[PDB]
Symmetry: D2
Subunit: 360 residues, 4 copies
């Protein structure tokens, strides 16, 4: 089979690999819709999680089952599935301790395009498939559902980590697709006033459609002073960090009230240290809790989030700015995320099969 792979830090290329073996609990899956992620750009070109050889890239897919292991009981060949970016080993220590996304070690539930061949190939492998794949609801388009795999779950996790409460004033820093889903998540956790902070302008407007009330432009003054002015010096109740760099945490601490939460979901691609300012952190004692976490995954997470689409309560289509057909175009799509043109949010790649609707 063909797949698009990382060939050591700094290089991608198409390669041929055998089809993965399918153990008793596993499933093999062919992609129907795929998206590329900014995370793969940090991983390939910044070496942000270390070196990899012949690793198929990608971790956002809707797919169709082409094989199941002997002990798979909930899935059959031909089933269409939402594939979560995180596919935990559910019996590992960290899963039993409430952190399945770190199953087998830090970030270990994130397999696809972390250390496991991902979804940018003709067939890919899923561990604990009964546990890790949700059936695609008949009322959701494959491209809408591909946004669940990572963008919705990660953005929403930012808002979960920020411990957002009913009527909270929230600031979301970074308004790419994960940030837009952090705004939506905060809205769905009951935030009132929501400040969206972008480098851009263009897609801070879409943030208003997901529940943002106030847009803050970096290219204007210091965002902290802008935020303190808008709040009459009081600051915000909670902060989600969904973009930026290692220096964004200091801004969050400076704009937030004492007794609060900062929820980071940004994959930090470079920099030795994240600096937290001693004074504005209440000299160690301000209860400004700092969290940084990898998204949940598995079937239940996808099922719960999918219900928001099915019930008309979340529109993920707004994130899709560019559409391609054919497995080859995942290369083109990943290069867009590397080069970041103006009107880009997320590309999606659809793949057609002649037995798409008849495979069994």
């Amino acid at each position: 089979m063909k797949g698009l792979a990382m060939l050591g830090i700094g290089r991608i290329g198409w390669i041929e690999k055998k089809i993965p073996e399918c153990g008793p609990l596993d499933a093999l899956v062919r992609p129907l819709a795929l998206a590329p992620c900014t995370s793969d750009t940090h991983t390939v070109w910044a070496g942000a999680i270390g070196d990899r050889h012949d690793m198929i890239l990608g971790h956002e897919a809707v797919g169709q089952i082409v094989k199941v292991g002997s002990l798979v009981k909930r899935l059959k060949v031909g089933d269409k599935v939402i594939v979560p970016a995180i596919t935990p080993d559910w019996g590992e220590e960290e899963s039993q301790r409430g952190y399945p996304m770190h199953s087998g070690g830090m970030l270990g539930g994130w397999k696809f395009s972390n250390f496991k061949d991902g979804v940018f190939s003709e067939v890919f492998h899923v561990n604990e498939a009964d546990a890790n794949l949700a059936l695609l609801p008949r009322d959701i388009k494959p491209e809408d559902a591909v946004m669940l795999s990572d963008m919705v779950t990660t953005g929403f996790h930012g808002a979960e980590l920020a411990n957002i409460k009913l009527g909270d004033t929230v600031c979301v820093i970074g308004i790419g697709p994960v940030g837009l889903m952090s705004v939506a998540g905060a809205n769905h956790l009951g935030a009132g006033r929501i400040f969206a902070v972008g480098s851009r302008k263009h897609c801070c407007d879409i943030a208003l459609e997901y529940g943002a009330t106030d847009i803050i432009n970096y290219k204007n003054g210091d965002i902290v002073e802008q935020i303190l002015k808008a709040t009459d010096g009081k600051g915000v109740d909670k902060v989600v960090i969904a973009g930026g760099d290692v220096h964004t945490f200091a801004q969050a601490v400076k704009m937030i009230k004492p007794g609060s939460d900062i929820g980071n979901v940004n994959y930090l691609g470079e920099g030795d240290n994240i600096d937290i300012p001693r004074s504005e952190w209440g000299v160690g004692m301000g209860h400004k809790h700092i969290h940084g976490g990898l998204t949940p995954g598995g079937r239940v997470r996808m099922e719960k989030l999918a219900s928001l689409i099915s019930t008309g309560k979340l529109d993920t289509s707004k994130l899709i700015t560019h559409r391609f057909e054919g497995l080859e175009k995942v290369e083109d799509a990943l290069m867009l995320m590397k080069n970041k043109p103006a009107d880009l949010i997320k590309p999606v790649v659809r793949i057609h099969y002649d037995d798409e609707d008849t495979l069994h």
Copy 2:
């Protein structure tokens, strides 16, 4: 002054009372907008919380300050305020351990029309005024803000007690005004599918506008069976009880998954015992958590919820089905709550003063 009072179990009438005394931390307030509550109905006619004589009724008000104590620092004469139904003693033991609504004993933060003269009088008393009174935002109509005092905060509290998570399937039992607010609260905590259980048709359309997806009418049969059918036997994730009686808890237990929460905010007006069925409660071990709580109050709770009106994220006007003018009309309004026409959600009474815009 005049006020409408409970004159022992089964009787109300107007009485004259002295204007209450104002201590250093207290405020005296006059009503600008008032609403009656079915709670006063249980208290008066069912004797649900014991006998009372000459206790002024009502605990839902937007008001205007007429006097402040010498130690009140945030408020002044003429300020217009949202009065929470619950006005805790914030330094009491129960407050220090995170339950201010029980300040000084069980239900002790619910003063107005529980054991303290309520808001249905020309002047009423607020303890710890700086802590307990939120300023009325200029962008909210008094009639909409009076829904914050109890309806919004109580219905939202049901959703909070039910521990609603993103994408959960929720059942709200009872769709009076509290119930509609439990649907809204559930929606604002991120619920997907939401079953609303009631019989009235307009309640069962406003509920859809607040985020209900599914309407369950008992006339179509046993509501548990209905819910189990609709969820292909798995049941719902979380339940909010916002109406019904002591037997509603068994229904909740029977329709909910193991590892779940039942959030009750219904004031139970009669019956010796709430029956929990042993087998369906997992013979003691089902992790079907049962919560029954009085609403939060105080200014912060009002400020936070008011922000949802100010930001366009909550429309409390849908709750108002009857409008009156003049203080004396709180009697007619309360009688609506007792006689219960199918026209009814919430009445509001508007009261004007010659110096409503000039008092200072």
Copy 3:
């Protein structure tokens, strides 16, 4: 092989069964140390969870691995293990949402002697062995470690469900071996004063050694009145239920403060309904939270609790009042749990093998 089985309601006896089949993730285990439980007593003689025929009893074992499946990676033949009473299916829905003890449905992680052949046989089966079996630390006697399987973990779980905070005054109702472990768990969650409710005198001294401060015997009168007197009417902060019957919950409600938690871990053997008194439950609004939960299990739970024995912080040996040798003596041991001499806390049965120290 032979095993001691429930032969329908009201009868036990020895039977021959095939050695169970071992799948890729499973392990077969032989008992080194066994204990009987009053739970099997309710199951057999009261029919508390329905009828069963030819189901092998017991769910408390230290064991030795005799076979592993092809996909078992952490265990090998001859390894000695602590077997949790609860052995979840970790990838099931309920596990993914944080309730692995209900994997596959309510009580579904409690397999042994609920619906799956238990540990009272020459060989028994463990699903998801790598996840579910902890290695026996070399510094713990098998007889002490067998208390971890259910007694420690269940009693500690009562304390966890009761939401015990530093310095809380706690009442533990029922001071059998689970109850003594609820006292210990409460002590290990930082409780100060701890009332232990029972009638037996030695239970009411071991309880003092585990952190009880106050012993309450019903023979001195109504236990609620006793507790209210002892707390000058304010009542207790938190209650753990570890014994009694369906009527114990009302006692708990009556003796506890508003804004509190009642943590039940008692397996209720009979009765249609658990009665919660309306007035004392704050007419629905007292924030007296009611929790009823099956113990956690799996290896991590066993590892964590075992660490408390290894570090000198928990002495489970005090629980053991009767010691037997040989597998057949699990019958005598279970009959002790049924006939209930005042001598009794927990029996343990030790089973030896010629190759106990050489099997590999």
Copy 4:
């Protein structure tokens, strides 16, 4: 009256001040037992929380009521009280939001020797006295209880912030008196293995008496490598930071597992930034939660912690290494904390009065 005051950053001296006025909710209190704190050394000589003029120092006291305001209902003249270092304004926004220690702003519940005249004077003032003073139990020595005001509550808060669970392996970094109470707190929250990390050796031994199992000497190698070696590379479950500097956080992150908590209570006296290492923080995603908080205070906190002394479950006497008599000796005692001799943990100063036992 005389008091020991901060006279601008860098200077202390004895000054004369009038006795404070006593408002309706206030109490005036004379000291019976006092302790100095390392925090006052950062505040005076490092200027760590800004400049102050004529501010009486100290915030650890047991005292006796000499005057009460007209609305004080729970205290009378002559009552002996445990005075918490934190005396919140319980109705302020932050208190209503669950953070009373930040009442009126970050650190605002910490009044004594933060910005309010403290306890090192013949008479001092307490706001909201009914809420903020606990009666001294008859079974606790004044000097034992002085350790509750700050040392026990802060150390225990470190363990609370570290989210310690039953059987957790914990590392406590910094083993001064706050650290020794963090070890005790972790023990009282159910930790198993506990590593105590000191610069010293002498009072790492006392740490074993409070539940530490392993001592780690800074003067030996890198504490992170020591800890990873002792845990077979697995690291610890939770970390409490109770001493050190801005660089201690990086050590905590490097020794802790993914999916975990670091609870800081160290008042950080200098340094612009606290550095968190990007890589070992899981490049933003390791769920290594970082918390830093000021202790709770008020009466209930003191009452709960005092119960641990009364019940024989906490011995605070072990912290007292030096004893003085007379109000003047608080100067001597504070200089010990500045200069830090070898065998010092905490000094205590007792003050005798001829009507100590007769004042009314």
